[PDB]
Amino acid sequence: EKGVDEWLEAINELREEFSAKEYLPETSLAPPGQSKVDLLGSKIKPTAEQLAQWE
Amino acid sequence: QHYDESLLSRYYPESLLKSIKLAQQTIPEDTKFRVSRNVEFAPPYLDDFTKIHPFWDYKPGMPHLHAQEENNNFSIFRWDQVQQPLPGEG
Amino acid sequence: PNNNDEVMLLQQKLLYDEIRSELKSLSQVPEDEILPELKKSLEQDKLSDKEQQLEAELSDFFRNYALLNKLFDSTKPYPNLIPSANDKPYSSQELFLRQLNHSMRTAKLGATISKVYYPHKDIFYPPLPENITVESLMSAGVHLGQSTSLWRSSTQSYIYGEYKGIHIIDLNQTLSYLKRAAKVVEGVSESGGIILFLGTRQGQKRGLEEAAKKTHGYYVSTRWIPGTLTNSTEISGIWEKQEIDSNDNPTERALSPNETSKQVKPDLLVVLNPTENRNALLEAIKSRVPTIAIIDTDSEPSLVTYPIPGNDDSLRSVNFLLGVLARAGQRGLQNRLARNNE
Amino acid sequence: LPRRIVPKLATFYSANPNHEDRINRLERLLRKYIKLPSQNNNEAQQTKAPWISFDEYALIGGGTKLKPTQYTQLLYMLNKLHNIDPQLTNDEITSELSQYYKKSSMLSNNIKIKTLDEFGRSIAVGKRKSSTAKVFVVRGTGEILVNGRQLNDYFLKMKDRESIMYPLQVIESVGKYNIFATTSGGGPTGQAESIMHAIAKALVVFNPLLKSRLHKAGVLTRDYRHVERKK
Amino acid sequence: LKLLNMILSMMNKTNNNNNTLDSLMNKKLLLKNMLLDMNNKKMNNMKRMLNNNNMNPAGA
Amino acid sequence: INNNKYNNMINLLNNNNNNYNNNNNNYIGNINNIYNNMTIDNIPMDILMYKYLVGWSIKF
Numbered sequence: 102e103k104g105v106d107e108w109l110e111a112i113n114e115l116r117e118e119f120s121a122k123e124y125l126p127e128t129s130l131a132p133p134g135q136s137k138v139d140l141l142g143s144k145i146k147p148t149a150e151q152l153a154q155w156e
Numbered sequence: 157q158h159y160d161e162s163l164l165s166r167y168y169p170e171s172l173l174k175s176i177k178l179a180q181q182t183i184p185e186d187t188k189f190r191v192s193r194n195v196e197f198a199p200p201y202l203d204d205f206t207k208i209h210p211f212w213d214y215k216p217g218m219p220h221l222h223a224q225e226e227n228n229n230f231s232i233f234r235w236d237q238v239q240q241p242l243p244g245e246g
Numbered sequence: 247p248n249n250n251d252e253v254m255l256l257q258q259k260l261l262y263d264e265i266r267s268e269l270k271s272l273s274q275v276p277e278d279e280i281l282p283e284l285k286k287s288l289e290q291d292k293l294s295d296k297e298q299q300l301e302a303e304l305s306d307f308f309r310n311y312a313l314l315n316k317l318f319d320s321t322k323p324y325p326n327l328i329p330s331a332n333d334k335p336y337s338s339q340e341l342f343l344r345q346l347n348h349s350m351r352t353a354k355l356g357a358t359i360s361k362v363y364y365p366h367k368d369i370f371y372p373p374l375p376e377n378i379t380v381e382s383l384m385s386a387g388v389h390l391g392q393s394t395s396l397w398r399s400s401t402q403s404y405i406y407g408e409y410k411g412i413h414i415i416d417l418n419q420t421l422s423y424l425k426r427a428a429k430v431v432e433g434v435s436e437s438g439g440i441i442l443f444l445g446t447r448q449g450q451k452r453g454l455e456e457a458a459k460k461t462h463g464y465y466v467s468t469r470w471i472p473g474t475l476t477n478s479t480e481i482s483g484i485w486e487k488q489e490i491d492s493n494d495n496p497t498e499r500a501l502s503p504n505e506t507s508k509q510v511k512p513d514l515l516v517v518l519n520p521t522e523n524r525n526a527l528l529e530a531i532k533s534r535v536p537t538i539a540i541i542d543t544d545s546e547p548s549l550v551t552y553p554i555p556g557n558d559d560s561l562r563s564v565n566f567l568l569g570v571l572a573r574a575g576q577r578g579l580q581n582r583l584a585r586n587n588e
Numbered sequence: 589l590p591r592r593i594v595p596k597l598a599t600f601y602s603a604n605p606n607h608e609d610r611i612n613r614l615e616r617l618l619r620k621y622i623k624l625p626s627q628n629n630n631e632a633q634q635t636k637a638p639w640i641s642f643d644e645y646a647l648i649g650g651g652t653k654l655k656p657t658q659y660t661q662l663l664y665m666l667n668k669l670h671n672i673d674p675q676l677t678n679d680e681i682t683s684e685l686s687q688y689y690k691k692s693s694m695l696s697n698n699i700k701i702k703t704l705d706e707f708g709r710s711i712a713v714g715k716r717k718s719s720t721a722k723v724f725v726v727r728g729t730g731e732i733l734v735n736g737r738q739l740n741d742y743f744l745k746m747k748d749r750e751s752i753m754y755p756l757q758v759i760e761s762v763g764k765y766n767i768f769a770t771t772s773g774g775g776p777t778g779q780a781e782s783i784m785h786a787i788a789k790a791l792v793v794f795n796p797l798l799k800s801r802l803h804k805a806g807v808l809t810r811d812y813r814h815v816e817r818k819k
Numbered sequence: 820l821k822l823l824n825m826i827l828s829m830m831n832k833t834n835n836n837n838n839t840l841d842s843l844m845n846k847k848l849l850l851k852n853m854l855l856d857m858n859n860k861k862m863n864n865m866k867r868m869l870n871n872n873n874m875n876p877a878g879a
Numbered sequence: 880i881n882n883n884k885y886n887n888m889i890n891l892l893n894n895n896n897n898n899y900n901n902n903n904n905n906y907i908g909n910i911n912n913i914y915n916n917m918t919i920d921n922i923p924m925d926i927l928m929y930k931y932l933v934g935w936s937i938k939f
C-alpha cells in the first residue's frame with residue numbers, strides 16, 4: 102500500500118525534524134522558508150447576491 | 157482530586173477527617189467546578205482553614221455577631237489591652 | 247551553481263500555498279455533503295494491516311505534537327514579503343526591493359565624487375584636533391562673527407578685522423583655543439568624568455546626541471531648567487542613577503536610596519550657544535564646574551573657563567567644532583578602555 | 589575595577605529624561621529605516637491604532653513632567669513606524685512598538701457573529717422612551733404583524749407606519765421581508781420607533797454590507813431622549 | 820479511517836487542481852498544516868479558560 | 880499579586896496540568912497550583928485599605 106507507505110514515511114520524517122529541536126508551534130511549524138508563525142478569520146466573504154445589492 | 161484517608165490523615169487533624177470523608181462521598185470525582193464572577197466567597201489567597209489565625213480570625217472567647225459560645229461562657233475578663241495585636245512583625 | 251537549493255524550497259513554498267488554499271475551500275462546504283458520504287465509505291471499507299499502522303501512528307503523532315505539547319515557552323531580511331507569481335508582474339514591495347538591489351550595485355557606476363562637502367560627515371567623521379587647519383575652519387564658516395553694530399568690545403583681542411559689515415574672527419587663535427579645549431575634553435573623558443553637551447538652538451540636537459554617544463556623555467537640546475545644578479535635588483533627584491565599572495558596563499548593583507538622591511554634578515559643561523544660556527553658565531560658576539563654550543563677537547569671554555572664538559550661528563560651524571571636541575573625547579574614552587584591557 | 593555612580597540616561601539633565609530617551613529610541617528606528625515605504629492601505633484607512641493612554645504613558649514617560657505635546661510627539665512616531673508596509677517591516681520595529689500597545693489585548697472580544705436562526709429569522713430588540721420592541725425578520729413578501737394584529741389596526745397614525753417602513757425603504761427591500769413585531773411599553777410613537785430601530789438592527793444579518801447605509805440614514809442609533817425629572 | 824481518510828480526501832481535492840512529490844513532500848506539508856490548525860484551537864481554548872477564571876484576584 | 884496568579888494559570892495550562900470536553904469545562908487544575916505563593920502571610924496585609932492616616936482637620 103504505497104499510500105500507507107508514503108504516509109508512514111512522511112509521519113516519521115516529521116517526527117525526526119520536530120525531535121531535532123524543542124517543539125514549539127510557532128517555530129517548529131513555520132511556513133516553508135519562514136521563521137515562525139504567530140498562533141493568533143471570521144471575515145465572511147459577501148455572496149454574489151449580497152455584493153450585487155450593495156453595488 | 158480524591159485522596160485516600162492515609163494521605164489526608166498525615167496533614168489534616170483527626171477532628172476534620174470525618175468532614176473530608178463525607179465530602180469525598182457526596183461530591184463526585186468528575187465534578188467540573190465553575191468559578192463565580194459575581195460573589196467572591198473564598199479569600200483571595202489559598203487557605204485550608206484548619207488553623208485559627210490570632211488576628212485574621214475572630215478571637216476565641218470574644219463576643220461578636222458570629223460567636224458560638226453561650227453568653228455565659230465567654231473568656232475575656234480583662235479589657236485593659238487590645239485583644240488582637242497586629243499580625244506578623246506587629 | 248547552488249540555485250537549485252533555493253528552488254527546492256520555493257517548490258515546497260508553492261505546494262504549501264496550494265494545500266492551504268484548498269483547506270479553506272473545504273471549510274466552506276457543509277458537513278452534510280462530505281461527512282455522511284465519508285463515513286459511509288468507511289462503513290463499506292475494511293482496515294488493512296498497513297492502514298492500521300497509520301491509524302495509530304497518526305493518533306500518537308497528533309496526541310504528541312498537537313495535544314500533549316507546550317503551546318509556548320517560559321532569508322532573514324524582509325521575512326514578510328509575499329512574493330508574486332512568476333507570471334504576474336512585480337508587486338510594489340518587490341519593485342522597492344528590486345530598486346534597492348540596483349542602488350547598491352549599479353546606481354554608483356560611472357564616476358566617484360571627490361572634494362565635495364557632505365553635511366552629515368561633519369557629525370559622523372569629525373577630524374582629529376591635530377589635523378585641523380585654518381582652511382578647514384574657514385570652510386565651515388567659523389570666522390564669521392556678528393555685525394560690527396553688535397560688537398561686545400571685550401572680544402577685541404579675538405578679532406582679525408571687519409569685512410562686509412561683520413567682524414572676522416582670527417582663526418589662528420580659534421585653532422589654538424580649539425586645541426586647548428579639545429585636550430580638556432579628552433582629559434576628562436580619559437579620567438571618567440561626566441561631560442554634558444548643552445545646545446538649545448534649532449537643529450543642534452543631532453550633533454549633540456552623537457557627541458554624547460561617542461564620549462559616553464550627556465546632552466540637553468530642549469531647555470536648561472534654571473537650577474539644574476544649584477537646585478539639583480528638586481529637579482533631578484527623581485531620575486535614575488546607575489553604577490558602572492571601569493569599562494562603563496553597568497555593574498547591576500542596586501543602589502541605596504542614599505546614593506540615588508545625591509547630586510550628580512557634571513565634570514565638564516560644553517555650551518554651543520552661551521549667549522542664550524547665561525543661567526547654565528552662572529550655575530556652572532556657582533558649582534565650580536569647568537565650562538567650554540563657543541564665543542562669538544557679541545559674547546562675553548570671561549564667563550567660561552575655556553572659550554573657543556567662533557561663529558555660533560551656523561550649524562556647520564557649530565557642528566564642526568562640536569565634532570572635533572566629541573572625537574577628542576572619544577579618543578580619551580578609547581585610551582581609558584585600552585589601559586584597562588592591558 | 590574602580591566603580592562610580594553615573595546618570596542612567598543620556599538625557600538625565602533634560603526636563604523629562606524618560607520621554608526624551610524613548611523618543612530618541614524611536615527616532616533611531618525612523619532613521620535606520622527611512623527608505624522603507626509606507627502602507628498604501630493608509631488611504632483605505634485601516635482601523636488599527638491601539639496605543640497606550642496619556643496616563644498610561646505617564647508611568648514610563650516622566651509622570652508629572654509629561655506634557656500633552658510630548659505625548660502627541662510619541663504618537664506621531666509610533667504611528668509612522670506602525671504604518672510601514674507590513675511586508676517590508678522587520679522585528680526591530682515591531683519589538684520597539686510592542687511596549688506601547690494597550691494591554692487590553694490580554695483578554696478577548698465579547699462579540700460573536702450574528703446569524704439567522706433555525707427558521708431563517710433575524711431577531712433584534714429596540715428601545716425608544718419607555719417602549720421596547722422584539723422583531724422577527726424573515727425573507728418574505730412584505731407581510732407585517734404587530735402583536736398579532738394588522739399594522740393599520742395597531743398603529744392608527746400614518747406617520748408611525750412610515751417610521752416602521754423607513755429602514756426597509758433605505759435598503760429598498762420593502763417587499764422582500766416578512767416582519768413579526770412584538771412591542772410593549774410606552775405609547776404609539778415609542779413603540780413604532782422602537783420597532784423601526786429593531787428592524788434596522790435585524791436587517792444587517794441578511795447583508796452586512798448595508799450597515800453603513802443604515803447607519804448613515806440614522807436608523808441604527810438608539811435614541812437616548814427620555815422624560816427628565818425637572819431639576 | 821477518518822483519521823486517514825480525511826487527509827486522503829484533502830489530497831484528492833488538491834488532485835483536482837493537479838489534473839512524485841505528492842507522495843512525500845505534499846503529504847508532509849499537509850500534516851504540518853493540520854498541526855498548526857490543531858495548535859491554534861488549543862491556544863483559543865486556553866484564552867477561554869483564562870477569561871472564565873479570576874485572573875485578577877486582588878483588584879482589577 | 881494579579882500577575883502572580885495569571886502566571887500560575889498560564890504555566891498550569893501550558894503543562895496540561897477528552898478534546899470535546901476541552902471546549903466546555905474551564906477547570907484549570909489543582910487549587911494549590913492556581914494559588915501558589917498566595918498565602919495568608921503575604922496577601923491579606925498588603926491589600927487592606929484605609930490603613931494610614933494621611934490628613935486631619937479639627938475645628939472649634
Ligand SMILES: [Mg+2]
Pocket residue numbers: 392542543557558559
Ligand atoms: Mg552669534
